[PDB]
Amino acid sequence: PQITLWQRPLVTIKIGGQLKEALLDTGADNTVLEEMSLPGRWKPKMIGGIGGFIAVRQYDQILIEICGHKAIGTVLVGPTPVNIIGRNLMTQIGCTLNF
Amino acid sequence: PQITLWQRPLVTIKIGGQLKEALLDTGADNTVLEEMSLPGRWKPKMIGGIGGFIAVRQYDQILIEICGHKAIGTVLVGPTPVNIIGRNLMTQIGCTLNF
Numbered sequence: 001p002q003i004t005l006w007q008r009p010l011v012t013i014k015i016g017g018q019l020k021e022a023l024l025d026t027g028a029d030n031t032v033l034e035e036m037s038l039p040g041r042w043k044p045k046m047i048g049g050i051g052g053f054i055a056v057r058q059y060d061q062i063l064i065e066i067c068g069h070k071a072i073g074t075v076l077v078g079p080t081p082v083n084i085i086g087r088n089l090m091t092q093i094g095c096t097l098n099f
Numbered sequence: 100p101q102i103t104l105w106q107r108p109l110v111t112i113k114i115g116g117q118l119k120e121a122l123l124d125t126g127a128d129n130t131v132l133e134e135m136s137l138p139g140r141w142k143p144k145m146i147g148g149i150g151g152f153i154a155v156r157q158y159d160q161i162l163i164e165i166c167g168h169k170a171i172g173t174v175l176v177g178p179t180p181v182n183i184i185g186r187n188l189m190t191q192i193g194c195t196l197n198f
């Protein structure tokens with residue numbers, strides 16, 4: 001799959017038995033999902049974007065299926081308006097920028 | 100150029116006679132630079148990221164040289180902590196995501 005950038009690079013994910021849409025985001029160090037319940041224990045974390053900071057819950061070794069490719073990594077959960085797949089997960093699916 | 104995502108995808112830009120480093124950001128609709136003086140007249144704009152909103156100045160038809168590729172487009176100027184090259188400029192340089 002080659003994805004051009006004329007539209008947002010949204011992909012379908014499967015995480016915790018749920019189907020979501022998420023944005024492939026090269027400008028994000030981390031992966032950030034809207035509120036959802038996840039197994040097992042987490043740690044509080046602040047992350048900064050443009051315009052300020054949000055509080056999130058850090059879950060490690062969480063299974064995610066991104067466009068049919070499985071990856072396990074750290075997933076942050078909190079009040080983001082868009083599901084974000086960051087570089088931590090993108091490297092696991094062999095995802096590159098090209099030009 | 101193929102860019103893997105193990106590190107931030109930072110590139111050198113030239114804009115308004117100045118050299119800067121900027122992040123190639125698939126998760127950004129717009130291009131956002133820290134405070135700098137630019138030719139032309141501008142319009143006020145609010146943009147939202149994670150954790151809130153910032154006020155920026157919208158400059159159109161601005162020349163930018165991104166990793167040696169010229170592009171002209173809308174550049175937003177304001178209190179972003181990182182220079183961000185968004186999709187609007189990335190399409191102009193033939194930039195794709197691949198995996």
Ligand SMILES: Cc1c(O)cccc1C(=O)N[C@@H](CSc1ccccc1)[C@H](O)CN1C[C@H]2CCCC[C@H]2C[C@H]1C(=O)NC(C)(C)C
Pocket residue numbers: 023025026027028029030031032047048049050081082084086124125126127128129130131146147148149179180181183185
């Ligand atoms: C800059 C920009 C636009 O011009 C237009 C639309 C969105 C954005 C925007 O802020 N996008 C961001 C993701 S968050 C997001 C929020 C709303 C919609 C889509 C994505 C960037 O892609 C990533 N963004 C780039 C960059 C922005 C300036 C501050 C430092 C980083 C923070 C980083 C980021 O947010 N990282 C998290 C791990 C917290 C997710």
